[PDB]
Amino acid sequence: EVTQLSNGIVVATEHNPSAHTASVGVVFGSGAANENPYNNGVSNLWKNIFLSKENSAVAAKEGLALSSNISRDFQSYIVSSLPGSTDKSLDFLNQSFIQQKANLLSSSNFEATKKSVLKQVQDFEENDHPNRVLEHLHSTAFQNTPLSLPTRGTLESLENLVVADLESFANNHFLNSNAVVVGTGNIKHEDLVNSIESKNLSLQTGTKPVLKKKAAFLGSEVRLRDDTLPKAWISLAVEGEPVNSPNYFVAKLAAQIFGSYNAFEPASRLQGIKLLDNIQEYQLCDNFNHFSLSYKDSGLWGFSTATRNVTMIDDLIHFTLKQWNRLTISVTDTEVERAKSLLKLQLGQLYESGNPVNDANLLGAEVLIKGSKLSLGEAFKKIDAITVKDVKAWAGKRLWDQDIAIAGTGQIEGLLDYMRIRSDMSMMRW
């Protein structure tokens, strides 16, 4: 059961007696979308300061494990431990992250962390193609709007930061009205609330800055061509649904219909996905996957693919977009029936895995928007209630003759112009 109390800070807890671990954490409603192009990467630097050697050493001496996660809409700082020592994690979180920040922002520590983060971002930008392609897709989809800033930070901006930027961001965003205290695993809600009440655990006053511009989607493309690479990596997307939309689960199911494909695994060549019937003959791709990502203001629905067949890219894109076209007009009931159970198993593993850190992140990110956490059972009935008419109604609105965003790198010379791709979003025979 999920129990949430608004006394003090918003305290959420999900109790699981079977687990042998307990996680206690703080989730902030600010993310990479709350920063600007001149201090971009301040959140990643804060994360790596919390994860620095001295802080991690003092934590691990007591027997605790530290996790930090940076995203568009939230920042997560989690302390995981054994069930008997769940009170010690609160003490470490109070003493280190909240009460005092002078020790963590010393000159030498800041310089070392800055040099390590610069090295990491430099390695990412050159030797991680499928993920940086998705980052550029975000950066070109939401350009000149908060949601397009990369979460790690750019190489040029990360140099200009000083400790003053970090402390300014901490003053502006680490607030009581922006925070949720989350408890996961083998702990009780009453015990957690009592433990918080015994201490003060006050973060700050409130009134975080309000953004003047809301995120917007622009049809656009960016091409980063490099002929010294062996493949071509391509990510393509349209505007999707945000969190708290009525069509959220319909979006995830429509994504699940096409699924993912790996050419080298024997089993995934026999899937009921009809798209493979066009792909398999000439080995058009090595792998693809479909995504329905949702944020607070907007979302992305699309796919990502990698291939060595540098002379047949347009055929791959054409067949994929013709499979997308089929959703509006001629989706069949068996497709939806398979999609329901595939999605239920897909959602089942996500929310019911052994690791409590994923549960903590999900619960903290959920209560910061909805105000409450949807149960597993009520999720299934909405999934089971989906019909063919709903899928057709959603697809006729979100992907029929709509603008797209594209991002590719590698031997993308075979990738045709924008308009030729944009015309594939309709059939013209219907």
Q: Which residues bind ligand CDL (CB under 6 A)?
A: 318, 427-429
By a kind-dependent CB cut-off of 5 to 8 A, residue 338 interacts, out of another protein, ligand CDL, none, with: none
Q: Which stretch binds another protein (CB under 8 A): 17-25, 93-101, 291-299, 414-422?
A: 414-422
Choose which of 419, 428, 429, 430 interacts with another protein (CB under 8 A).
419
By a kind-dependent CB cut-off of 5 to 8 A, residue 418 interacts, out of another protein, ligand CDL, none, with: another protein
Q: How far is the CB of 418 from another protein (least distance, A)?
A: 5
The residue (of 64 and 404) whose beta carbon lies closer to another protein is 404
Q: How far is the CB of 421 from ligand CDL (least distance, A)?
A: 11
Tokens 């973060």 sit at which residue? 203
Question: Which tokens in the block code for residue 21?
Answer: 């671990």
The residue (of 419 and 428) whose beta carbon lies closer to another protein is 419
Helix (H) or strand (E) holding 67: strand 65-70
User: Could you give the CA distance from residue 325 to residue 323 in angstroms, rounded to a whole number?
Assistant: 5
The residue (of 380 and 418) whose beta carbon lies closer to another protein is 418
* Buried/exposed code over 371-402 (b: 16+ C-beta within 10 A; e: otherwise): eebeeeeebeeebeebeeebbbebbeebbbee
Phi, psi of 200 (to 5 degrees): -80, -60
Q: Which stretch binds another protein (CB under 8 A): 131-139, 284-292, 315-323, 412-420?
A: 412-420
3-state helix vs strand vs coil in the chain, percent to 5: 50, 20, 35
- DSSP letter, residue 239: E
By a kind-dependent CB cut-off of 5 to 8 A, residue 389 interacts, out of ligand CDL, another protein, none, with: none
Q: Is 227 in the site for another protein (CB under 8 A)?
A: no
**Residues forming beta bridges with residue 294, ordered by sequence position:** 299
The residue (of 265 and 417) whose beta carbon lies closer to ligand CDL is 417
Q: How far is the CB of 430 from ligand CDL (least distance, A)?
A: 8
Question: Which tokens in the block code for residue 424?
Answer: 């594939």
> Binders of another protein: how many residues, by CB under 8 A?
4
Q: How far is the CB of 221 from another protein (least distance, A)?
A: 8
Q: How far is the CB of 309 from ligand CDL (least distance, A)?
A: 16
Q: How far is the CB of 420 from ligand CDL (least distance, A)?
A: 8
User: Could you give the CA distance from residue 161 to residue 48 in angstroms, rounded to a whole number?
Assistant: 14
Q: Is 417 in the site for another protein (CB under 8 A)?
A: yes
- Sheet order of strands, 10-15 included: 2-5, 10-15, 179-185, 22-28, 75-81, 65-70
User: Could you give the CA distance from residue 178 to residue 165 in angstroms, rounded to a whole number?
Assistant: 19
Choose which of 107, 127, 205, 228 interacts with another protein (CB under 8 A).
228
Instruction: Draw the binding track, 370-409, toward another protein (x: CB under 8 A; -: no contact).
Output: ----------------------------------------
Helix/strand/coil for 280: coil
Question: Which tokens in the block code for residue 62?
Answer: 């007591």
List Cβ neighbours of 167 (8 Å cut-off, separation of 6 or more).
Answer: 101, 105
Q: How many residues does the chain have?
A: 430
The residue (of 228 and 349) whose beta carbon lies closer to another protein is 228
By a kind-dependent CB cut-off of 5 to 8 A, residue 380 interacts, out of ligand CDL, another protein, none, with: none
Which ranges of 174-218 does DSSP label H, i.e. alpha helix?
189-198
By a kind-dependent CB cut-off of 5 to 8 A, residue 6 interacts, out of another protein, ligand CDL, none, with: none
Say if residues 244 and 369 touch (Cβ distance below 8 Å): yes
User: Could you give the CA distance from residue 388 to residue 411 in angstroms, rounded to a whole number?
Assistant: 39
Q: Which residues bind another protein (CB under 8 A)?
A: 228, 417-419
